[PDB]
Amino acid sequence: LRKCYFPYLENGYNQNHGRKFVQGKSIDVACHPGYALPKAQTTVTCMENGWSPTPRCIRVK
């Protein structure tokens, strides 16, 4: 019921940019060299309230 729209990361690789995923589906988020998802995550999914890891590849360096 809570569908998750894949947002736009500024300096990341939005493989599935502009695509809606149904709650329960997953997708990995890659970023430019030096950036990575919070808590060293590589994937983000529509757990319930939305993208649970939250697709924001913050600069790890």
The structural domain count equals: 1
Helix content: under 10%
CATH class: Mainly Beta
CATH superfamily: Complement Module, domain 1
Mind describing the biggest β-sheet? 2 strands, antiparallel
Structural class, by secondary structure, is mainly beta
Could you give the count of β-strands?
8
Strand order of the largest sheet: 1-3
Name the CATH architecture: Ribbon
Q: What's the helix count? A: 0
| CATH-assigned fold name | Complement Module, domain 1
Helices and strands, in order, run as EEEEEEEE
The portion of residues forming beta strands comes to: 25-35%
The outline comes out as globular
Calculate Rg over CA atoms.
11 Å
Distance from N terminus to C terminus (CA atoms, Å) equals: 37 Å
Subcellular location: Secreted
Protein name: Complement factor H
Organism: Homo sapiens (Human)
Detailed description of the structure:
This protein starts with a strand and ends with a strand. It is built from no helices and eight strands. The chain has one domain: Ribbon (Complement Module, domain 1). 0% of the residues lie in helices and 30% in strands. The protein has a two-stranded antiparallel ribbon. It has a two-stranded antiparallel sheet with strand order 2-5. A two-stranded antiparallel ribbon has the order 4-7. The chain is globular and about 35 Å long. It has 61 residues and is mainly β. It is found in: Secreted. Disulfide bonds join 4-46, 31-57. This is Complement factor H. It comes from Homo sapiens (Human).
